[PDB]
Design an enzyme around this catalytic site. Sequence first.
Site, mmCIF file in Angstrom:
data_model
loop_
_atom_site.group_PDB
_atom_site.id
_atom_site.type_symbol
_atom_site.label_atom_id
_atom_site.label_comp_id
_atom_site.label_asym_id
_atom_site.label_seq_id
_atom_site.Cartn_x
_atom_site.Cartn_y
_atom_site.Cartn_z
ATOM 1 N N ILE A 21 0.860 -1.169 0.000
ATOM 2 C CA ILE A 21 0.000 0.000 0.000
ATOM 3 C C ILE A 21 0.903 1.228 0.000
ATOM 4 C CG2 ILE A 21 -1.903 1.181 1.159
ATOM 5 C CD1 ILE A 21 -1.175 -2.402 1.995
ATOM 6 N N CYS A 22 0.352 2.369 -0.406
ATOM 7 C CA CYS A 22 1.066 3.645 -0.391
ATOM 8 C C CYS A 22 0.194 4.747 0.204
ATOM 9 C CB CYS A 22 1.539 4.020 -1.792
ATOM 10 S SG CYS A 22 3.066 3.197 -2.284
ATOM 11 N N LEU A 23 -0.363 4.507 1.386
ATOM 12 C CA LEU A 23 -1.078 5.565 2.086
ATOM 13 C C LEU A 23 -0.108 6.648 2.530
ATOM 14 C CD1 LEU A 23 -3.724 3.764 4.319
ATOM 15 C CD2 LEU A 23 -3.562 4.001 1.833
ATOM 16 N N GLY B 3 -2.008 7.063 -3.274
ATOM 17 C CA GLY B 3 -0.589 6.966 -3.560
ATOM 18 C C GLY B 3 -0.284 6.032 -4.712
#
Lengths: 487, 146, 76, 76, 79
Positions: free
Chosen positions: B83-85, C76
């Site tokens: 994930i890229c929160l 993102g």
Amino acid sequence: REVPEYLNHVSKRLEEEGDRVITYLDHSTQKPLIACVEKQLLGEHLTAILQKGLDHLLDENRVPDLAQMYQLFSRVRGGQQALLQHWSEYIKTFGTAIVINPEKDKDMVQDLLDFKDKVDHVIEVCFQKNERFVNLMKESFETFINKRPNKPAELIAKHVDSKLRAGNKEATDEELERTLDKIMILFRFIHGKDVFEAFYKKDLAKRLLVGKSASVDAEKSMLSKLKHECGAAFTSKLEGMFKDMELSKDIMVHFKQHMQNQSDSGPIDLTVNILTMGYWPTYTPMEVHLTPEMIKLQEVFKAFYLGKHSGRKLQWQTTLGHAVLKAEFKEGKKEFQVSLFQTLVLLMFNEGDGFSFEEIKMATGIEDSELRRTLQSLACGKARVLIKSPKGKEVEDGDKFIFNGEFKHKLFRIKINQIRQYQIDAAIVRIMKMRKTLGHNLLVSELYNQLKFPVKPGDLKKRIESLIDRDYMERDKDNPNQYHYVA
Amino acid sequence: ALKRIHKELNDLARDPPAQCSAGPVGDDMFHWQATIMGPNDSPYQGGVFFLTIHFPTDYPFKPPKVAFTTRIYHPNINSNGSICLDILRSQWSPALTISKVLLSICSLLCDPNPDDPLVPEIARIYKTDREKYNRIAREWTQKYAM
Amino acid sequence: MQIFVKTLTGKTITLEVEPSDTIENVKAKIQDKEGIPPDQQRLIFAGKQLEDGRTLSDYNIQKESTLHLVLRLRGG
Amino acid sequence: MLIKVKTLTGKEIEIDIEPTDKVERIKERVEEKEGIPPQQQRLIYSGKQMNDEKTAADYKILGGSVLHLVLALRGG
Amino acid sequence: KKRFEVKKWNAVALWAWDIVVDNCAICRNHIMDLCIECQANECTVAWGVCNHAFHFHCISRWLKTRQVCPLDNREWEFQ
Ligand SMILES: [Zn+2]
Ligand SMILES: [Zn+2]
Ligand SMILES: [Zn+2]
């Protein structure tokens, strides 16, 4: 013949046939003969035997005949299954008699405990501890105990209070815990358990704040079962109470030292419990006209406690307190452990031998409904510290209670304080998976047969539309009434 | 710290989040496994996507490395399950607890942002044609989540 | 009627709301309850952002429900 | 012990089980109090999909240990 | 003849917080209770201009990692 004798007759006959085979008939004929006689004696009369004998026999607790009955019925194919039903239905029939009648409330639990012990005993001796019968014993009790909402939990809660109370000196330590263990096996079957806590918590609240618990070790033993039976979340608030009692005694050591260091220590010997407001039962604060010596004692403590823990606030519970009032009667001095209301009212009966119901009321400020209850404790009780004018059981506004200077009592120290959305969705796909093709009408019919709650037509259609969107179900190309199973 | 993780574990066992569930996989309390049931009214309906949390040695003041184990179709989640929160890399806040990071991920399953996407190949499909997105995500859910 | 919301600090607070009420006022109630700015909340119900320009009745919210509060995030 | 099997909607179904019951027993108990037959459950306890042959003692299920229930509409 | 005197007394009193527990967010402890690190053996509570409560031992470390309040995004100063 009656069933109990008939079973002995069948038991006899089978062994004779079993004896004949060893005597002169070929061993290869052993099985067909036994099944032949067994089929005719029991296989053709299973329901007839059970209806006539089982329900009567179970009530009498006739151990041998049931042992013979279960032993014999196992031979027939499906015979044991027929025994589970009429035995199971017996529990739901005789069980409901225990709980359904509200007139039997005072003798509810002991019947449930006794009747629980009885059926368990039949399982251990007669039915050879058959696991299948154990389950349907558990599943059956779960049913009929819950046919009365919220009352069995109340009575079980009230029952445990009686067992633990200091008045329960008769049951020793070892006997008590066995009784509780039988209760916990019964408390499991209840569904409204969240109602059991509040009734057991309110009772446990009274136990601690008046020191009437028989055995502290029995108290902690009880929670150790609930915590193991319902997790720390269920018993979280309960354990907070025990901490408060534990913590309060520590406060007393420090507080008492403070008063000793002060040269102005009132004759009044003081003890105050500090209880976390969140856990304990909700109490309504109510004002009382405390005396000038009385009001001070809280002030030093309140400031002291607050000075030791900032951010707190001690709001007092005059209702739950209790004081002692040594008295000067005509035949010796007596002590009276009296609640604050009784303390204040009894402090109105020395200057004047009597006062009117209203004369006392504005003196103290108690609510009339509870002041009457207090005054009844001071007039109508066994320790008649007042003479009601007119005499009677109940108090009236015109009563001029007269202090009893001729009070006689055996004890020196005396007490007076006695007074569906997904469910629809799941079924639809489940039913339609088996069918592979179905119309709207039947799909609607089987739902209420398969769903045990009301289903609105508007709600029912919406789920069908939602399931269409998710590709679970598909309408026919030309028949919207007809659906087909997709996957 | 462990005590923070202990308190999180206890307060999660007592009062669990609705559609989330996380607990240690074994003896090591720093390695949890979680589970995000697919939020209702979404292509992920009825799905059960397993995460894999890893708490650092200073967990209160440093994010946990959560990473999907069930291959999820999402512009913000690569095929490797990472994930890229922003909350999880840059704007980590100690006040945010595991019951909250899991719920935020659950919410973001339905609220992607194809702008600055971790997977531009899916981001283009999402930005252009959302109708096809809700079918490809549905088939991925059906072939991985169920 | 009222509604439950689980703040970030572990506590839980109950909000007195009506279905006609918009989410912006809900966030303002969260603010004056504990004070994190209207922008930073991100209310979650069944894993859904509670959009600012909408009302509870839009999201099928009833009595004794629960709303989850988190910190504002992004993709993102 | 009591396990409360709370589903997506937040309804918290109560259940009772002995410490050694096989999870098929748990699903069956859920069937009685909720109505979904054991084929269509997928019980998730603390982020581990429970397997239909493990005993409840395997997972360290205690009193008041909340499970999660998720519907598998196919469910064979 | 006339005697209004008391000789003993027991009572109880429920204690409640002045405003609220003010749950620390870093460590999840109770404000009177010490910091989670400070429990392992003078752990004071430090306010932000948000009025947000945090144990000094927690918020100091967080500030050493970030000059930002964790709940609100404002900056950290006491009164
Ligand atoms: Zn500290
Ligand atoms: Zn702040
Ligand atoms: Zn702290």
